[PDB]
Design a protein around this ligand. Structure first.
Ligand code: FMN
Ligand code: FMN
Ligand code: NCA
Ligand code: NCA
Ligand code: NA
Ligand code: NA
Ligand code: NA
Ligand code: NA
Ligand code: NA
Ligand code: NA
Ligand code: NA
Ligand code: NA
Lengths: 404, 404
């Protein structure tokens, strides 16, 4: 069903805001949204070039790219997700950032590392193991799958964790700059590698990177500090999902509560800001959503108020913000402090002109979950076409191709 | 009467375009429009700050400031026009350019020098004469006015012309950069100083700055070349009005036809572009308008086709573009080559959101000639208010005040 909405034109959503070194002209953001339309070698494709281009047309919009692998060890999906570790990746991404910039908009790349959830057969083909802070599995099924192919999850050694900072993320950051990205965003949410380090259910290390709240945060803060010296703190973001149970994170049922874990991290970030090394933004997932799953009010165990209390800089919030449309009471409350951005991910898939629709109160086109993760153009770039012109069968067969 | 118009949203008017180092997101421009709401010392005012701010809200719009004096000798209006020759001027303008930039828009300052039309009593109070390329007057009345106060027009000496390049315009350019302007625009139109140099009715010099087509253009090209080394060619524009008879320019009735004079100048500009020193844009007044006066098709003696044929860079055209509204056939033809901007001046006075109105086909508010040149806020910033709230008598008494 089309979502009826009232116009946000005269609201804070269309007041400018400085984020790092750049000024956005709308507070509506496209959050990182995995779609699997990259090329098989992980280079961004012709489809992605149009896709991000189509969403950049309100000048001064921030778009954040779908999770992008920092390195071969960072991968582990069967579908084709993009990567930012080779010159080829960077050159292809550059065509996309150029297009976004030509519309006066900005783009952040989300850097992901799968960790314990990497598909063990996929990793085997690279001669790699699934790796994590500790040797744990999301489920007994995951454990079975890995041991079946003789490719069990293993804990990174101390030196490998150092390598993550000085090699894997450093190179990804350098490539992201070659590719013209305005920001890099550390993916510390949804039970992927950095989240695995942060929380105790997934990190039982006995070196400097585990064994306490402070040690578990150490890798993340070392990345923030090191990358700040490489690209500048103004080009760095980080995403967290304190309440999510996606990919079997314990969350509030863990031995350390997310309020403790994440308040520690956010306060350390603010202390860096106080010293003139404030990162560009902290992106947080609202408790209405866990990964890609909606959460009932009854199941919600907390909220993100603590982030606003502790961190004085820009905050990006996302998670079913249209739940109280058409009036958007929650959205308006959340952006009232003038330093908060609001993201829409699912509705941006089916509404490439979402910023324009929200501005002028145009009904939203419903999204199509069936085509979120498929491998072709149908339900991807087709939302930018007039229905009468979409040749469905042709588009289902249109797989990603090289740019140009 | 409100002008009925069709939406330009899907037209070239909303395709991006690179102008110098910056990219505009609309081809609709606010051309330089004198309004006399500066402070008495010529520092920009609180009223001007809001006025330009109000017109910058479509992100990526180019605004061009009202003619701004390069120096004390450049002045000569009774009304209060702004200047860019002191630190105070620059600091005040900076608040205005900051505001425009915070909306993602850009601003060019038009640098004017009045010359033979400077009010002789005003110039007397500065201890200065009206000056020009040659000692000529716009009319017998102008001659009478000047001789009456014992302050006749005089020809600049050769050294004074050099001073214009190395001192007057150089300092204005440096201040414009201090003030954060994206471009400086040489005013070579409408019978002011640079136009007085270009055309033979106003320039009968016998030094290197007159006596031939090439010598008459020499000062203008020396300014282009010298300022290009100071601020970079990408930050320079120039405005010409080949067909105008404003302030008694002979135009087509002169001993050298404007097609000759202005084709010479534009071709010299293109030759600089060919060598990598191409200026940002050439602004031309369409033959529908002469200064502030509409011209009948019957009286029009030529057109600006030659500029498009000779110059390969960005062109800004202005002059009663709504004459064939609501369809805008002429506007669409003129921007079809993808390197042409179109300006609206009179309708931008009464429609601060003009870009938005044109985008979505909203009827235009009629402009009010009676308040074009008055000294107070009524009919100036009042167009941004809802009529029901305008206290007319209060606004008529609201004269310009210092910013902040
Ligand atoms: C298809 C899909 C792909 C997603 N991919 C990512 C991702 O790559 N990185 C990420 O941090 N979140 C991802 N998310 C979570 C979303 O960014 C977003 O936080 C969530 O969908 C809630 O926002 P919404 O209600 O506006 O969709 C994804 C969600 C969906 C539905
Ligand atoms: C009140 C007024 C002030 C103007 N001031 C300037 C100026 O300072 N410099 C300039 O080059 N042209 C000036 N012009 C000419 C306009 O920029 C424009 O070229 C002309 O008005 C035709 O455009 P329009 O039909 O959209 O008004 C002015 C015109 C008007 C009506
Ligand atoms: N990378 C992510 O955080 C992600 C991907 C797909 C669905 N939900 C979350
Ligand atoms: N400066 C100008 O070119 C100008 C000023 C007022 C009216 N018309 C033209
Ligand atoms: Na655009
Ligand atoms: Na999985
Ligand atoms: Na989580
Ligand atoms: Na808030
Ligand atoms: Na704005
Ligand atoms: Na006069
Ligand atoms: Na003229
Ligand atoms: Na043209």
């Amino acid at each position: 069903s089309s979502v009826k909405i009232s116009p946000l034109k005269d609201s804070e959503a269309f007041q400018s805001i400085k984020v790092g070194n750049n000024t956005l002209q709308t507070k509506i953001v496209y959050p990182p949204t995995t779609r699997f339309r990259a090329l098989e070698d992980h280079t961004p494709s012709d489809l992605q070039l149009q896709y991000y281009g189509d969403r950049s047309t309100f000048p001064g919009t921030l778009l954040i790219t779908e999770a992008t692998f920092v390195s071969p060890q960072a991968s582990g999906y069967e579908g084709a997700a993009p990567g930012i570790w080779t010159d080829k990746h960077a050159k292809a991404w550059k065509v996309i950032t150029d297009k976004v910039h030509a519309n006066g908009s900005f783009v952040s790349t989300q850097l992901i590392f799968l960790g314990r959830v990497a598909d063990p057969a996929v990793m085997k083909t690279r001669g790699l193991n699934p790796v994590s802070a500790s040797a744990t599995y999301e489920s007994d099924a995951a454990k079975e799958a890995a041991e079946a192919v003789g490719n069990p999850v293993r804990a990174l050694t101390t030196q490998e964790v150092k390598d993550l900072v000085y090699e894997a993320y450093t190179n990804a950051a350098q490539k992201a700059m070659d590719a013209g990205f305005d920001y890099i965003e550390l993916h510390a949410a949804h039970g992927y590698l950095l989240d695995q380090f942060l929380q105790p259910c997934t990190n039982q290390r006995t070196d400097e990177y585990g064994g306490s709240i402070e040690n578990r945060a150490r890798l993340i803060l070392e990345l923030i500090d090191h990358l700040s010296t490489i690209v500048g703190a103004d080009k760095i973001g980080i995403r967290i999902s304190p309440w999510a149970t996606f990919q079997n994170m314990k969350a509030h049922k863990d031995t350390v509560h997310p309020l403790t874990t994440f308040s520690y991290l956010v306060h350390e970030l603010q202390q860096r800001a106080d010293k003139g090394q404030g990162i560009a933004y902290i992106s947080v997932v609202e408790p209405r959503v866990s990964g890609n799953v909606d959460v009932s009010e009854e199941d919600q165990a907390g909220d993100n108020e603590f982030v606003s209390k502790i961190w004085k800089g820009v905050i990006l919030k996302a998670g079913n913000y249209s739940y109280d449309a058409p009036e958007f009471k929650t959205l308006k409350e959340d952006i009232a402090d003038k330093r908060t951005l609001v993201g829409f991910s699912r509705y941006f898939t089916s509404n490439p002109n979402l910023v324009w629709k929200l501005r002028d109160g145009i009904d939203l086109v419903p999204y199509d979950r069936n085509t979120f993760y498929s491998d072709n153009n149908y339900g991807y770039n087709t939302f930018s076409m007039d229905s009468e012109e979409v040749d469905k069968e042709l588009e289902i067969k249109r797989v990603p191709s090289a740019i140009e």
